[PDB]
Design a protein around this ligand. Structure first.
Ligand SMILES: O=c1ccn([C@@H]2O[C@H](COP(=O)(O)OP(=O)(O)O)[C@@H](O)[C@H]2O)c(=O)[nH]1
Lengths: 697, 10
């Protein structure tokens, strides 16, 4: 009876919309009992199975739907979504393209196709496909919100104010109607949403995990209530998809090995396979235990492994980012579960207990922005492995080509030995800065740069062109190894002015908004002799930024773009800037640590969101409060002072140069010890029978 | 990892 089955199918659709997925599944199945050859019920059932993470069962039903109805466009598009989740991009594309072939006006299929282009880095095509979707279906929250993010990525600010208004209105409607918001939690920081809206977005995404673990029918775990089974050692589990060549590893790769084996037993749970890098090698060798959970795709069996390991504190380093398996945390295999470092915001999730942060980043008065209890590190929660990865940058020398500290820079593990081989090296006392006069050796180096040569030899020492690192040692370029040569870095390599101030920002362009570019333009106009240095991150954002800047009155030559560089070159070339202008919308995080390691002062204006306050936290730890602006006028005033008062610039640069070493900011040994003290606070609290509470002293 | 849209067939 297709008629009765149709009624059941429609009722299932309604239940599905209401978030009652179990009842929907039951009804679709009943529809198939009444009408076994019901293509629509097969396809609709598959979609809810997909929601429950039953991907192979979903595929089976999609294929059944298409067997019954070979031109069933909805089934193809829906099947494409499942293949995409399965990491079969070619298959997904084949499905979406088939769906559009059948129905040229299939809005959802155009939007789903767009998502592939977006993920591939083809933003213009994503934008085109999302626009087609919105033309065919103007009320389409998923397409609108994903289009908004595409535009954000390339700094396309067309109708920006109205766009933000609509995003907020969409989210409000979805929240009121109990639907999953079309704005991703990780992106919510970029839009003028209330803190309440941002937390509610995160909460609802957190709840999706339950759809995927509910079908596992697992009981609650019994947790350890003491450290007896572990010989008085606290078992800490670090869970991350980013053990390998990823910013997360560039920040914390040293921490597992630095933990005190007398008090802690460290387990690292990798959600990704071995990428073959030294980052992966290091963590695997230095953790007490290393577990490749990428080999255990079932979250149930994977959670079982974590529980059976006896983990006391399980640490979520992904939050809502690519590669996350928050389902593992939803199963609570550990008695205490903490967010740390990898995700700049609240999980909003029932299954997370704490967020490790700090007083500057997350002041107590903003506790309402987070579902987790706040757990303060004593300085900043941020950390970086720069002192271990890039020790060649601890010292520098310059060439006096006329004394600037940032026009022609030398760095090298054997730099002092090289300098000692020269008869005429002078010192500028700040540690202090050796200067090579404009001699035969200096011309030799400059010639190498101008001739585009890869490297030369002087007094037995290899002197490398900083633009050619991948040709000399690719491991040194990625940061897997410390470069063994003396490296030359020059403003001329990047087309930077020799006789003007360079303001830089090396972040992905999506962190810039109209208000920020306007601030920057205000600074440039007040400091005639200056340029802004940005990255093609991505390159298609460049012409957009240029257009807005030109319209603000800045000629094209005041904004210099460089390509994204290998890790080592990126950190090293920060030495060429005078000042970094931080993005207030979302700060540099890793990027902030990168620029400070070069000794480059960073001007920041902290906001209310965690992501907007990290840079100020870094600077507070560094001991440079003069770089923290309370408002737009001050941000501008500070940057302008640094660009016009060269004696003040010199003093602030010296402060950063010294304090990156003397302060706790890059001190991983110290950080780890403080992290441990915090872990023990959490444990003692739990062992006394307490639920989580703020650890903010 | 950009999310997608399932179509409910009536
Ligand atoms: O020219 C560049 C610019 C940046 N990066 C790196 O690219 C990553 C950017 O990641 P993300 O946007 O997440 O940085 P964050 O938001 O933490 O500042 C960081 O590891 C940078 O060190 C790089 O290798 N070369």
């Amino acid at each position: 009876c297709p008629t009765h089955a149709d009624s059941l199918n429609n009722l299932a659709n309604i239940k599905r919309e209401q978030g009652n997925i179990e009842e929907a599944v039951r009804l679709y199945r009943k529809a198939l009992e009444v009408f076994p050859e019901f293509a629509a019920a097969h396809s609709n059932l598959a979609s809810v199975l997909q929601q429950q993470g039953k991907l192979q069962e979903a595929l089976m039903h999609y294929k059944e739907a298409i067997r019954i109805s070979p031109t069933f466009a909805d089934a193809y598009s829906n099947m494409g979504n499942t293949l995409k989740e399965m990491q079969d991009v070619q298959g997904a594309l084949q499905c979406y393209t088939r769906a559009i072939q059948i129905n040229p006006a299939f809005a959802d299929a155009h939007s789903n196709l767009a998502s592939i282009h977006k993920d591939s880095g083809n933003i213009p095509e994503a934008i085109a496909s999302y626009r087609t979707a919105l033309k065919l279906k103007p009320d389409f929250p998923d397409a609108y919100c994903n289009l908004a993010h595409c535009l954000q990525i390339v700094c396309d600010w067309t109708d920006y104010d109205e766009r933000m208004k609509k995003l907020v209105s969409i989210v409000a409607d979805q929240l009121e109607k109990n639907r999953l918001p079309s704005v991703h939690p990780h992106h919510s920081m970029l839009y003028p949403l209330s803190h309440g809206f941002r937390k509610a977005i995160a909460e609802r995404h957190g709840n999706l995990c339950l759809d995927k673990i509910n079908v596992l029918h697992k009981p609650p775990y019994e947790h350890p209530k003491d450290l007896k089974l572990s010989d008085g050692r606290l078992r800490v589990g670090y869970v991350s998809s980013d053990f390998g060549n990823h910013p997360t590893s560039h920040l914390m790769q040293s921490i597992p090995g630095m933990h005190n084996p007398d008090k802690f037993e460290v387990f690292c749970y990798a959600l990704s396979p071995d990428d073959g890098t030294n980052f992966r090698v290091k963590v695997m060798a230095e953790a007490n235990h290393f577990i490749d959970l990428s080999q255990i795709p079932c979250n149930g069996k994977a959670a079982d492994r974590i529980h059976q390991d006896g983990i006391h504190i399980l640490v979520n380093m992904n939050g809502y980012t690519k590669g996350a398996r928050n389902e593992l945390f939803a199963l609570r295999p550990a008695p205490i579960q903490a967010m740390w470092l990898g995700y700049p915001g609240t999980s909003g999730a029932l299954f997370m207990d704490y967020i490790i942060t700090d007083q500057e980043t997350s002041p107590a008065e903003v506790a309402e922005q987070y579902s987790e209890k706040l757990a303060y590190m004593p300085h900043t929660f941020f950390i970086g492995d720069h002192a271990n990865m890039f020790p060649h940058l601890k010292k520098k020398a310059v060439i006096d080509f006329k004394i600037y500290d940032n026009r022609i820079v030398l760095n090298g593990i054997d730099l002092k030995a090289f300098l000692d081989s020269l008869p005429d090296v002078k010192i500028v006392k700040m540690l202090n800065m050796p200067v090579i006069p404009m001699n035969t050796i200096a011309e030799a180096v400059i010639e190498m740069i101008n001739r585009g040569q890869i490297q030369i030899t002087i007094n037995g020492f290899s002197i490398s062109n900083g633009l050619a690192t991948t040709q000399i040692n690719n491991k040194a370029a990625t940061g897997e190894e410390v470069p063994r040569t003396i490296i030359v870095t020059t403003r001329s390599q990047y087309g930077l002015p020799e006789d003007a101030i360079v303001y830089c920002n090396f972040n992905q362009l999506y962190k810039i908004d109209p208000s920020t570019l306007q601030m920057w333009a205000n600074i440039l106009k007040r400091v005639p002799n200056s340029v802004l240095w940005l990255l093609r991150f991505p390159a298609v954002g460049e012409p957009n930024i240029q257009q807005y800047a030109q319209n603000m009155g800045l000629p094209q030559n005041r904004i210099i773009f460089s390509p994204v560089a290998p890790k080592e070159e990126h950190v090293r070339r920060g030495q060429l800037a005078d000042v970094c202008l931080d993005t207030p919308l979302c700060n540099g995080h890793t990027t902030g640590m990168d620029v400070l390691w070069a000794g480059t002062p960073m001007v920041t204006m902290p906001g209310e969101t965690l992501a907007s306050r990290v840079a100020a936290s870094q600077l507070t730890c560094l001991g440079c409060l003069e770089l923290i602006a309370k408002n737009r006028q001050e941000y501008e005033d500070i940057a302008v002072k640094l660009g016009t008062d060269l004696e003040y610039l010199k003093k602030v640069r010296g402060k950063v140069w010294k304090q990156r070493i003397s302060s706790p900011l890059f001190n991983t040994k110290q950080y780890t010890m403080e992290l441990e003290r915090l872990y023990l606070q959490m444990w003692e609290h739990y062992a006394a029978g307490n639920k989580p509470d703020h650890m903010i002293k | 990892e950009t999310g997608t849209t399932n179509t409910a067939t009536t």
